Amino acid sequence: DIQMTQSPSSLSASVGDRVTITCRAGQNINNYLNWYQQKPGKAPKVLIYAASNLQSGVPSRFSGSGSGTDFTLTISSLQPEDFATYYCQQSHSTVRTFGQGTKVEIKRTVAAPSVFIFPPSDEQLKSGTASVVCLLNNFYPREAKVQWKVDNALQSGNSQESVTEQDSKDSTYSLSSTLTLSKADYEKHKVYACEVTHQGLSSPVTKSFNRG
Amino acid sequence: VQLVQSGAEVKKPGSSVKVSCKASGGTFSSYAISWVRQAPGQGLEWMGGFVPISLTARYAQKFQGRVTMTADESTSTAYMELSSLRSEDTAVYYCAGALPRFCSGGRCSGWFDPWGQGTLVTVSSASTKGPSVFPLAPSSGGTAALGCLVKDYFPEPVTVSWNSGALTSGVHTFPAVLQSSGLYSLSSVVTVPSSSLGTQTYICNVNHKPSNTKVDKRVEP
- Are B10 and B107 part of one and the same domain? yes
Residue where a domain stops, chosen among B123, B148, B178: B123
Q: Say how far residue B104 (Cα) sits from the centre of its chain.
A: 36
All CATH 2.60.40.10 domain ranges of chain A, comma separated, are 4-107, 114-210
For residues A207 and B145, what is the distance between their CA atoms, to the nearest angstrom?
Answer: 13
- Are B118 and B146 part of one and the same domain? no
Q: Tell me the shortest Cα–Cα distance from A61 to chain B, in angstroms.
A: 20
- Are B37 and B65 part of one and the same domain? yes
Mutation pick from B5, B111, B179 vs chain A, by most beta carbons of A within 10 Å, is B111
Cβ contact B176–A162 (<8 Å): yes
Q: How was this structure determined?
A: X-ray
- Are B60 and B106 part of one and the same domain? yes
Cβ neighbours for B145, distance < 8 A, ≥ 6 positions apart: A114, A116, A135, A137, B136, B138, B189, B190, B191, B192
Question: Which residues sit opposite B96 in a β-bridge?
Answer: B34, B115
**In terms of CATH architecture, what is A4-107?**
Sandwich (2.60)
Residue where a domain stops, chosen among B123, B146, B171: B123
Kindly list the residues from chain A whose CB atom is less than 8 angstroms away from the CB atom of residue B56.
none
**Cross-chain CB nearest to A121 (options B118, B134, B176):** B134
Q: Tell me the shortest Cα–Cα distance from B206 to chain A, in angstroms.
A: 16
- State the resolution, in angstroms: 2.8
Q: Tell me the shortest Cα–Cα distance from A143 to chain B, in angstroms.
A: 17
Residue type, B109: S
CATH number of the domain at B208, please: 2.60.40.10
Q: Say how far residue A47 (Cα) sits from the centre of its chain.
A: 21
CATH of domain A114-210: 2.60.40.10
For residues A54 and B67, what is the distance between their CA atoms, to the nearest angstrom?
Answer: 33
Nearest-5° Cα angle at B158, B152 to B159 = 135
Q: CB of B94 within 8 A of CB of B109? A: no
Q: CB of B111 within 8 A of CB of B49? A: no
**Cross-chain CB nearest to B43 (options A101, A131, A178):** A101
Q: CB of B59 within 8 A of CB of B47? A: yes
Q: B159, B68, B64: which is closest to B120 by C-alpha?
A: B159
- Are B17 and B105 part of one and the same domain? yes
- Are B93 and B162 part of one and the same domain? no
Size of interface A-B (CB pairs under 8 A): 120
Cβ neighbours for A11, distance < 8 A, ≥ 6 positions apart: A19, A21, A102, A103, A104, A105
* Torsion of the alpha carbons at A56, B48, B109 and B55, rounded to the nearest 10: -110
CA atoms within 13 A on the CB side of A121: 21
- Are B68 and B112 part of one and the same domain? yes
Query: What does chain B look like in DSSP terms, one character per residue?
Result: --EEE---EEE-TT--EEEEEEE-SS---GGGEEEEEE-TTS-EEEEEEE-TTT--EEE-TTTTTTEEEEEETTTTEEEEEE-S--GGG-EEEEEEE----SEETTEE-----SB---EEEEE-SSPPB--EEEEE----TTEEEEEEEEEEEBSS--EEEEGGGTB-SSEEEPPPEE-TTS-EEEEEEEEEEGGGSSSS-EEEEEEEGGGTEEEEEEE--
Mutation pick from B45, B107, B136 vs chain A, by most beta carbons of A within 10 Å, is B136
**Chain B residue closest in CA terms to A119:** B136
Query: What does A78-108 look like in DSSP terms, one character per residue?
Result: --GGG-EEEEEEE-SSSS-EE---EEEEEE-
Kindly list the residues from chain B whose CB atom is less than 8 angstroms away from the CB atom of residue A137.
145, 172, 189, 191
Domain count, chain B: 2
- Are B137 and B117 part of one and the same domain? no
* Torsion of the alpha carbons at A166, A104, B35 and A67, rounded to the nearest 10: 160
Residue where a domain stops, chosen among B104, B123, B142: B123
- Are B92 and B13 part of one and the same domain? yes
For residues A102 and A85, what is the distance between their CA atoms, to the nearest angstrom?
Answer: 5
Which ranges of chain A does DSSP label H, i.e. alpha helix?
122-125, 183-187
Exposed, middle or buried: residue B199 (CB in 10 Å: 0-12, 13-18, 19+)?
exposed
Q: Is-cis flag, bond preceding A141, omega within 30? A: yes
**Cross-chain CB nearest to B110 (options A1, A91, A116):** A91
- Are B31 and B69 part of one and the same domain? yes
Q: CB of B23 within 8 A of CB of B3? A: yes
Nearest-5° Cα angle at B177, B171 to B183 = 120
**Chain A residue closest in CA terms to B179:** A160
- Are B47 and B149 part of one and the same domain? no
Domain that includes residue B61, residue range = 3-123
